[PDB]
Amino acid sequence: AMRLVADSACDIKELRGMVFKAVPLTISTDNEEFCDDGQLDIHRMLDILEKHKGRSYTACPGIDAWLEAFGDDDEIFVVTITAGMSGTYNSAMAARAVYLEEHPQAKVRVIDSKSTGPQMRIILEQLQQMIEEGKKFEEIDGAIDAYMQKTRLFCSLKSLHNLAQNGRVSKVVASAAEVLGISVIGTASSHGTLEAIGKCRGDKKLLVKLQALLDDAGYEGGKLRICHVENEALADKIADMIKQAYGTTDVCVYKAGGLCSYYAERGGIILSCETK
Ligand code: NA
Distance 229 CA to ligand 1 centre (A): 14
Deposited resolution, Å: 1.8
Q: Experimentally, how was this structure solved?
A: X-ray
Distance 22 CA to ligand 1 centre (A): 31
Distance 45 CA to ligand 1 centre (A): 20
Distance between first and last Cα of the chain: 31
Q: How far apart are CA 116 and CA 271, in angstroms?
A: 10
Collapse the DSSP code of 170 into the 3-class scheme (helix H, G, I; strand E, B; otherwise coil) and give the result.
coil
> Domains of the chain (ranges plus CATH)?
1-23+62-147 (3.40.50.10440), 24-61 (2.20.28.50), 149-276 (3.30.1180.10)
The residue count of the chain comes to 276
Distance 183 CA to ligand 1 centre (A): 5
Sheet with 33-35, side-by-side order of all strands: 33-35, 26-28, 57-59
Distance 171 CA to ligand 1 centre (A): 14
Distance 31 CA to ligand 1 centre (A): 27
Backbone phi, psi, residue 132, to 5°: -70, -30
Distance 158 CA to ligand 1 centre (A): 4
Sort 23 into a burial class: Cβ within 10 Å, 0-12 / 13-18 / 19+: buried
For CA atoms 223, 108, 5, 154, give the dihedral sign.
Answer: negative
Q: How far apart are CA 153 and CA 228, in angstroms?
A: 13
